[PDB]
């Protein structure tokens with residue numbers, strides 16, 4: 043998972 | 053999944 | 063005239079609705095406030111999430127539904143939720159200003175607002191059309207609550223198992239609705255057929271939402287604005 | 301006296317902080333409103349979720365962090381997020397009334413409130429103790445921002461890979477902090493050691509939160525109140 047974090051990390 | 057729904061359905 | 067069992071169904075549905083629908087919309091102040099990149103998303107996501115919980119509450123009280131397998135219950139909710147949302151929302155809809163009036167400026171929802179929640183005008187149009195048409199049917203509270211339960215018990219839903227028992231329950235409900243309009247609704251020879259029609263218009267609206275939502279859903283910067291319940295009900299995890 | 305590279309680090313951190321921390325707390329009105337079964341949960345969940353995004357923003361600007369593997373970045377964030385939250389929150393903490401003062405009555409957070417978000421007094425106590433002690437160190441903005449970056453780059457975090465490079469980056473930061481206090485902070489011979497101490501107190505607070513959160517997290521009626529970002533950062537999916 044970690045879709046959100048990956049996105050927020052650009 | 054569907055943990056929430058299962059709970060809301062009592 | 064109606065029977066005792068049918069009349070006991072009307073009571074249960076009407077009571078369930080009253081118990082899960084507030085005409086004063088006082089709970090809306092607990093949602094993340096509206097803001098006119100999808101600035102309405104946070105607020106509408108909360109409005110929808112709140113409503114699911116309410117549809118669940120109403121559903122649990124539909125005679126026969128409680129006895130279905132947990133899976134079928136879930137299956138019916140997942141596929142009809144948005145449709146039930148649109149149906150009950152008609153109560154707040156106003157032909158006067160073509161909007162869902164739930165409060166002052168803040169809780170009055172214009173077609174424009176749903177756009178700031180990731181929805182185009184092209185598909186926002188049929189919703190208004192559906193709302194307007196449905197409003198014009200001046201349904202009695204007993205017919206509005208029946209139609210919602212009919213919708214919910216549509217055997218034609220992806221994921222359903224005992225579709226024969228769902229089919230049967232829905233038919234019992236369809237009976238009460240036809241009888242009721244016959245006996246109690248002066249001037250409604252076409253009403254029934256008109257109402258059944260609405261169920262099909264909902265199907266399209268449903269399919270349309272599914273696409274819009276899927277897009278939104280896949281962009282993490284957006285799905286992070288949604289709530290766990292929404293993500294679950296509209297999610298596609300088998 | 302400091303060098304050019306070290307001084308360029310101070311600037312970057314101070315700027316990153318200013319860019320991710322509002323002393324007026326004006327965004328708090330966009331959160332679901334507070335309510336004094338875990339009535340504060342909805343609001344605090346939003347406060348925490350908002351803060352993660354801010355810690356991410358600050359992190360992205362820590363010299364050296366951007367060059368770490370996406371995985372290590374994620375690994376450091378997941379395990380330190382709550383600690384960074386507690387550190388930055390000190391700015392809003394008040395020894396005067398033992399609370400985080402962010403607004404009128406609504407945004408003033410008492411120990412009591414965190415309880416209505418599923419947290420006992422037993423563990424809420426050490427947090428206040430940590431807040432009070434840390435406040436008493438009258439840190440300069442340059443030391444407060446350094447300590448946060450130190451904390452974030454702790455090589456001792458479950459899930460980390462290149463712990464040697466994390467270890468090195470953290471040491472470079474620890475240098476600037478020691479030098480800075482030496483040159484620029486009149487009267488701080490013990491300060492450094494005191495600050496390093498705080499990092500260990502955070503570890504406990506962290507572990508404690510993990511337990512509390514796990515419990516909350518496992519009850520669906522509660523996790524449904526949290527946000528996708530919180531569920532993700534504090535979630536345990538490898």
Ligand SMILES: C=C1/C(=C\C=C2/CCC[C@]3(C)[C@@H](C(CCCC(C)(C)O)CCCC(C)(C)O)CC[C@@H]23)C[C@@H](O)C[C@@H]1O
Nearest residue numbers: 113148150151154162171176179185186189267270271275
């Ligand atoms: C909820 C209720 C109310 C209004 C309904 C609305 C107005 C805002 C936008 C909604 C919620 C429509 C949206 C769904 C948006 C959700 C999401 C997750 C952002 O994809 C439309 C999608 C349908 C079309 C066909 C337009 O694409 C469906 C019904 C519309 C208020 C009150 O009556 C309670 C009721 O209970």
Ligand SMILES: C=C1/C(=C\C=C2/CCC[C@]3(C)[C@@H](C(CCCC(C)(C)O)CCCC(C)(C)O)CC[C@@H]23)C[C@@H](O)C[C@@H]1O
Nearest residue numbers: 351386388389392400409414417423424427505508509513
């Ligand atoms: C956020 C910020 C602020 C305050 C911090 C608070 C007050 C409310 C409760 C918090 C958020 C503590 C909570 C975590 C609650 C979250 C959850 C998901 C419900 O488990 C405590 C857990 C720690 C102990 C040890 C008490 O169990 C940690 C820091 C506390 C305001 C502003 O300074 C920005 C800052 O950025």
